[PDB]
Scaffold this active site. Structure first.
Site, PDB file in Angstrom:
ATOM      1  N   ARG A  67      18.784   3.352  25.521  1.00 28.20           N
ATOM      2  CA  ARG A  67      17.734   3.702  26.498  1.00 28.20           C
ATOM      3  C   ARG A  67      18.069   4.544  27.758  1.00 28.20           C
ATOM      4  O   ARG A  67      17.173   4.867  28.536  1.00 28.20           O
ATOM      5  CB  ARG A  67      16.943   2.447  26.887  1.00 28.20           C
ATOM      6  CG  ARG A  67      16.151   1.824  25.732  1.00 28.20           C
ATOM      7  CD  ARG A  67      15.388   0.575  26.184  1.00 28.20           C
ATOM      8  NE  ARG A  67      16.221  -0.641  26.203  1.00 28.20           N
ATOM      9  CZ  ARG A  67      15.950  -1.737  26.921  1.00 28.20           C
ATOM     10  NH1 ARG A  67      14.877  -1.787  27.708  1.00 28.20           N
ATOM     11  NH2 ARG A  67      16.711  -2.818  26.798  1.00 28.20           N
ATOM     12  N   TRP A  82      20.466   9.156  17.451  1.00 27.99           N
ATOM     13  CA  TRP A  82      21.686   9.390  16.672  1.00 27.99           C
ATOM     14  C   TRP A  82      22.349   8.039  16.387  1.00 27.99           C
ATOM     15  O   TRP A  82      22.150   7.081  17.138  1.00 27.99           O
ATOM     16  CB  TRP A  82      22.667  10.347  17.376  1.00 27.99           C
ATOM     17  CG  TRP A  82      23.087   9.965  18.768  1.00 27.99           C
ATOM     18  CD1 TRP A  82      23.984   9.001  19.122  1.00 27.99           C
ATOM     19  CD2 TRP A  82      22.641  10.572  19.985  1.00 27.99           C
ATOM     20  NE1 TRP A  82      24.125   8.966  20.489  1.00 27.99           N
ATOM     21  CE2 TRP A  82      23.315   9.918  21.045  1.00 27.99           C
ATOM     22  CE3 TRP A  82      21.736  11.603  20.290  1.00 27.99           C
ATOM     23  CZ2 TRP A  82      23.107  10.265  22.393  1.00 27.99           C
ATOM     24  CZ3 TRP A  82      21.528  11.942  21.630  1.00 27.99           C
ATOM     25  CH2 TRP A  82      22.210  11.273  22.661  1.00 27.99           C
ATOM     26  N   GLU A 120      26.541   0.494  12.963  1.00 28.32           N
ATOM     27  CA  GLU A 120      25.359   0.392  12.094  1.00 28.32           C
ATOM     28  C   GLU A 120      25.716   0.680  10.636  1.00 28.32           C
ATOM     29  O   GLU A 120      25.220   0.015   9.720  1.00 28.32           O
ATOM     30  CB  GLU A 120      24.254   1.355  12.544  1.00 28.32           C
ATOM     31  CG  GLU A 120      23.627   1.035  13.896  1.00 28.32           C
ATOM     32  CD  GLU A 120      22.531   2.036  14.302  1.00 28.32           C
ATOM     33  OE1 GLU A 120      21.396   1.908  13.803  1.00 28.32           O
ATOM     34  OE2 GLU A 120      22.793   2.934  15.138  1.00 28.32           O
ATOM     35  N   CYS A 144      16.785  -1.820  21.854  1.00 28.73           N
ATOM     36  CA  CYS A 144      17.535  -0.561  21.849  1.00 28.73           C
ATOM     37  C   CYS A 144      18.616  -0.398  22.931  1.00 28.73           C
ATOM     38  O   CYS A 144      18.309  -0.416  24.130  1.00 28.73           O
ATOM     39  CB  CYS A 144      16.555   0.619  21.915  1.00 28.73           C
ATOM     40  SG  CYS A 144      17.297   2.277  21.690  1.00 28.73           S
TER      41      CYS A 144
HETATM   42  C1  HEM Z   1      19.415   8.538  21.316  1.00 32.37           C
HETATM   43  C2  HEM Z   1      20.179   7.587  20.602  1.00 32.37           C
HETATM   44  C3  HEM Z   1      19.744   6.325  20.149  1.00 32.37           C
HETATM   45  C4  HEM Z   1      20.656   5.347  19.908  1.00 32.37           C
HETATM   46  C5  HEM Z   1      22.173   5.567  20.246  1.00 32.37           C
HETATM   47  C6  HEM Z   1      19.934   4.137  19.481  1.00 32.37           C
HETATM   48  C7  HEM Z   1      20.522   2.941  19.036  1.00 32.37           C
HETATM   49  C8  HEM Z   1      19.827   1.808  18.614  1.00 32.37           C
HETATM   50  C9  HEM Z   1      20.433   0.679  17.969  1.00 32.37           C
HETATM   51  C10 HEM Z   1      21.945   0.405  17.780  1.00 32.37           C
HETATM   52  C11 HEM Z   1      19.430  -0.136  17.555  1.00 32.37           C
HETATM   53  C12 HEM Z   1      19.626  -1.415  16.627  1.00 32.37           C
HETATM   54  C13 HEM Z   1      19.322  -1.033  15.150  1.00 32.37           C
HETATM   55  C14 HEM Z   1      19.654  -2.122  14.131  1.00 32.37           C
HETATM   56  O1  HEM Z   1      20.404  -3.075  14.431  1.00 32.37           O
HETATM   57  O2  HEM Z   1      19.156  -2.024  12.982  1.00 32.37           O
HETATM   58  C15 HEM Z   1      18.191   0.516  18.014  1.00 32.37           C
HETATM   59  C16 HEM Z   1      16.952  -0.070  17.873  1.00 32.37           C
HETATM   60  C17 HEM Z   1      15.782   0.486  18.384  1.00 32.37           C
HETATM   61  N1  HEM Z   1      15.663   1.675  19.091  1.00 32.37           N
HETATM   62 FE1  HEM Z   1      17.133   3.008  19.372  1.00 32.37          FE
HETATM   63  N2  HEM Z   1      18.562   4.381  19.523  1.00 32.37           N
HETATM   64  C18 HEM Z   1      18.422   5.716  19.909  1.00 32.37           C
HETATM   65  C19 HEM Z   1      17.188   6.313  20.070  1.00 32.37           C
HETATM   66  C20 HEM Z   1      15.949   5.732  20.051  1.00 32.37           C
HETATM   67  C21 HEM Z   1      14.728   6.391  20.203  1.00 32.37           C
HETATM   68  C22 HEM Z   1      14.633   7.926  20.279  1.00 32.37           C
HETATM   69  C23 HEM Z   1      13.762   5.436  20.261  1.00 32.37           C
HETATM   70  C24 HEM Z   1      12.355   5.558  20.435  1.00 32.37           C
HETATM   71  C25 HEM Z   1      11.655   6.658  20.874  1.00 32.37           C
HETATM   72  C26 HEM Z   1      14.428   4.140  20.100  1.00 32.37           C
HETATM   73  C27 HEM Z   1      13.752   2.885  19.896  1.00 32.37           C
HETATM   74  C28 HEM Z   1      14.333   1.745  19.432  1.00 32.37           C
HETATM   75  C29 HEM Z   1      13.617   0.541  18.928  1.00 32.37           C
HETATM   76  C30 HEM Z   1      12.123   0.112  19.035  1.00 32.37           C
HETATM   77  C31 HEM Z   1      14.513  -0.229  18.266  1.00 32.37           C
HETATM   78  C32 HEM Z   1      14.219  -1.543  17.437  1.00 32.37           C
HETATM   79  C33 HEM Z   1      14.041  -1.294  15.925  1.00 32.37           C
HETATM   80  C34 HEM Z   1      13.719  -2.549  15.108  1.00 32.37           C
HETATM   81  O3  HEM Z   1      13.208  -3.548  15.653  1.00 32.37           O
HETATM   82  O4  HEM Z   1      13.948  -2.534  13.880  1.00 32.37           O
HETATM   83  N3  HEM Z   1      15.794   4.344  19.962  1.00 32.37           N
HETATM   84  N4  HEM Z   1      18.439   1.706  18.654  1.00 32.37           N
HETATM   85  N1  LIG Z   2      21.169   4.806  16.039  1.00 33.98           N
HETATM   86  C1  LIG Z   2      19.898   4.660  15.692  1.00 33.98           C
HETATM   87  N2  LIG Z   2      18.688   5.136  15.962  1.00 33.98           N
HETATM   88  O1  LIG Z   2      18.995   6.299  16.525  1.00 33.98           O
HETATM   89  N3  LIG Z   2      19.421   3.815  14.785  1.00 33.98           N
HETATM   90  C2  LIG Z   2      18.376   3.187  13.982  1.00 33.98           C
HETATM   91  C3  LIG Z   2      18.411   2.055  12.989  1.00 33.98           C
HETATM   92  C4  LIG Z   2      19.268   2.427  11.811  1.00 33.98           C
HETATM   93  C5  LIG Z   2      19.799   1.404  10.816  1.00 33.98           C
HETATM   94  N4  LIG Z   2      20.635   0.445  11.530  1.00 33.98           N
HETATM   95  C6  LIG Z   2      20.663   2.125   9.790  1.00 33.98           C
HETATM   96  O2  LIG Z   2      21.875   1.838   9.743  1.00 33.98           O
HETATM   97  O3  LIG Z   2      20.130   3.001   9.071  1.00 33.98           O
END
Ligand code: HEM
Ligand SMILES: N=C(NO)NCCC[C@H](N)C(=O)O
Ligand code: HEM
Ligand SMILES: C[C@H](O)[C@H](O)C1=Nc2c(nc(N)[nH]c2=O)NC1
Ligand SMILES: C[C@H](O)[C@H](O)C1=Nc2c(nc(N)[nH]c2=O)NC1
Ligand SMILES: N=C(NO)NCCC[C@H](N)C(=O)O
Lengths: 362, 362
Positions: free
Chosen positions: A68, A237, A242, A65
């Site tokens: 963070r 968000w 994405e 992520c």
């Molecule tokens: C607040 C804004 C947030 C943004 C801007 C964000 C953005 C991202 C992005 C770009 C990815 C890659 C997704 C992909 O390539 O499919 C990701 C993955 C992830 N995020 Fe976030 N995230 C947010 C919030 C959160 C929250 C609230 C949590 C957990 C409480 C979190 C947990 C993770 C985890 C575990 C992954 C890996 C998912 C997977 O392995 O499929 N993120 N996030």
């Molecule tokens: N930006 C965030 N999480 O907040 N993303 C979560 C994974 C979403 C996935 N990549 C999609 O396009 O649907």
């Protein structure tokens, strides 16, 4: 052997958690209570403070992520009191409403009852709470190919879609004591959608593209102090790429680059003209402009990397080590233009954290 | 212990090499000769066929190289007969002339005498045979920052540059028996250079950019059958992104994105406009167009990935396993638009191969 592993993980969690909270005194006592509880039932119940801080730590340890930096501002919703199918439905309806917040999205998570003796109390089948269906008739593709298997399972239970490129899937989950899951169609008043237009090119609307506003991952397991919460939906968000560089660009998804090239007036004859790279730039510019116009939260990749840099510095300042996965942290467009590309990360797993689990269907 | 390691690696190389060549019969005999030679001198001498095929296999095992499809067409130049400084200079002059081939570049390698008892016969200081100097006066940056240390070492030996953004460094190497290296200025008639212009935007020439035509890595070690060839310059042809997305774009190199944005008529005020991504597209388009106009070989990233795909298939068909480094194989622009992005690779090291070695300067 399950009773042993549970005690170990509980010993490390309580100390580390109460230390960050400045309650190191109470560590000695609470541990004695948890120990007695484990011998009595075979598990323990987290306090409100413990579960709330635990979900926050888990986000902080998520190697993949890039968002963070805002880990300490997470909105935690405690729903460990649910007992019926109607209770679950109303809670899921409530998550979408409060997280959306009329556009100004709020990062949130809803906590359902955890596993007992490895057995679940509530099992969610959706990958994300809001997602489009996918069909693959002998004729061709309709919808999102990544939703094929889940779509087939829903229709095996009585559901039926309209077969457009954007049909909303229904909520589908199973209660303990039932052999098969139940389903509920999503109310249209609760789901925000955004039509895609371009700031300067008026013909872009002829493509008739659109995407939903809030991504809510609902099929991962949250592990805190040896306790397994298999059901715990969470959301942040969207980061522009994405949608514009993966969901609508991948050949195994919507595959739209050739059509984009057509409406912007460029030729698709020669690779040396780099038409794919140019089409990606205009599509991604369109996604950011459209979300902002309608007032829905979104972030570009350069701003996002900048925020993540501040995160690395804060962690160093607090005395904690940094972990991460380079292959997922770099953006799918112009990666060498961000700092992430020019450094390395340790891909070790630290708990509490979020994990993958086997899919009931398929 | 050095005599033992040498024998092991020689046993595996001869068998594997003669097997691919269909000369498995001669394996038994040749091995008996090499063994006797090792006891007599403490090393062995490769035949012309053995060294030629060995350099080819080494390219085939290079995990970080995306151009491995043309591995069997490598032009091998045997110069193990050199003894003086004049001999080395003429051979290096000859490599640049024949590899350039008036624009239609030929992938080549020149083989100098290998190490004896760990001691070198010829030691090359240049990173690439053709490269620009870099200065960092208290005032600001002039030239290529990546050449700082090597530039300082050359001036410590009597050389002096003009201090433009594109000064050609001289050849610099050391012969066995001398404490310090010698240098020779490069003849201008042997070096092709390409001015950068744009197919539609006439104002692009105001930036006054240019780059050289042939990249010749000259500081890596080639290892074949236990024998260490510390001196063995090699070359292929450029992939567009190497110049337009890294050499001229990186903030730690020429840092030109802001200036590019200015000549094409776009604003640099907001990240949501994605000006960096657009500037990268026009600069990279300019690099491909300019090289082609002047008749110098070059390849775009989409065509390159397509060729690499055919390589993977051929290796499977021949019965050999595939090794590679994902983090170096993906292009720095639009990576998700190529197949490489959507799969995984085994980053194991197989010999013969090319390796990094410590720099004499610094
Ligand atoms: C607040 C804004 C947030 C943004 C801007 C964000 C953005 C991202 C992005 C770009 C990815 C890659 C997704 C992909 O390539 O499919 C990701 C993955 C992830 N995020 Fe976030 N995230 C947010 C919030 C959160 C929250 C609230 C949590 C957990 C409480 C979190 C947990 C993770 C985890 C575990 C992954 C890996 C998912 C997977 O392995 O499929 N993120 N996030
Ligand atoms: N930006 C965030 N999480 O907040 N993303 C979560 C994974 C979403 C996935 N990549 C999609 O396009 O649907
Ligand atoms: C014929 C055309 C060739 C092309 C199109 C090509 C392209 C590439 C590219 C894009 C890289 C990455 C460079 C970087 O990011 O700095 C690379 C690395 C490499 N290539 Fe090639 N190459 C070619 C020929 C060769 C030859 C002739 C050899 C060897 C005989 C070879 C050996 C390697 C090795 C070892 C690396 C890694 C260099 C390092 O670690 O710094 N390539 N090549
Ligand atoms: C899925 C597999 O691990 C592969 O490395 C990728 N897919 C993705 C990726 N990066 C992101 N963020 N999302 C992906 O789907 N990089 C790698
Ligand atoms: C150098 C370090 O290993 C880091 O992963 C990178 N630099 C480079 C890279 N990729 C290429 N091709 N060239 C680089 O300079 N990716 C990674
Ligand atoms: N395309 C090839 N080899 O043929 N490249 C080698 C490395 C060159 C380095 N990236 C540069 O820009 O100078």
């Amino acid at each position: 052997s399950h009773m042993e592993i549970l005690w170990n993980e509980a010993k490390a969690f309580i100390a580390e958690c109460y230390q960050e909270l400045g309650k190191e005194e109470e560590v000695k006592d609470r541990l004695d209570s948890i120990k007695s509880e484990i011998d009595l039932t075979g598990s323990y119940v987290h306090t409100k403070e413990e579960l709330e801080h635990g979900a926050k730590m888990a986000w902080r340890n998520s190697n993949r992520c890039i968002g963070r930096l805002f880990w300490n501002s997470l909105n935690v919703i405690d729903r460990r009191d649910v007992r019926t199918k109607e209770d679950v439905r109303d809670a899921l309806f409530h998550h979408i409403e409060t997280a959306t917040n009329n556009g100004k999205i709020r990062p949130s998570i809803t906590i359902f009852p955890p596993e007992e003796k490895g057995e679940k109390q509530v099992e969610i089948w959706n990958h994300q709470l809001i997602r489009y269906a996918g069909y693959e008739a002998a004729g061709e593709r309709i919808g999102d190919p990544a939703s094929c298997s889940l779509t087939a399972a829903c229709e095996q239970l009585g559901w039926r879609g309209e077969r457009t490129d954007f049909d909303l899937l229904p909520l589908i989950f199973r209660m303990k004591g039932d052999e098969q899951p139940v389903w509920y169609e999503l109310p249209r008043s609760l789901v925000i959608e955004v039509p895609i237009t371009h700031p300067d090119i008026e013909a872009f609307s002829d493509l008739e593209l659109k995407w939903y506003g809030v991504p809510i991952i609902s099929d991962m397991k949250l592990e805190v102090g040896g306790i397994h919460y298999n059901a715990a939906p969470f959301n942040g968000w969207y980061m522009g790429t994405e949608i514009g560089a993966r969901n609508l660009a991948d050949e195994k998804r919507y595959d739209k680059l050739k059509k984009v090239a057509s409406v912007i007036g460029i030729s698709t004859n020669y690779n040396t003209d780099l038409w794919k790279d140019q089409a990606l730039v205009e599509l991604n510019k369109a996604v950011l402009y459209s979300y902002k116009k309608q007032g829905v939260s979104i972030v570009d990749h350069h701003t996002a990397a900048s925020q993540f840099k501040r995160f690395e510095e804060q962690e160093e300042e607090a005395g904690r080590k940094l972990t991460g996965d380079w292959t997922w942290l770099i953006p799918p467009i112009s990666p060498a233009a961000t700092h992430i590309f020019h450094r390395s990360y340790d891909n070790s797993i630290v708990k509490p954290n979020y994990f993958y689990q086997d899919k009931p269907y398929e």
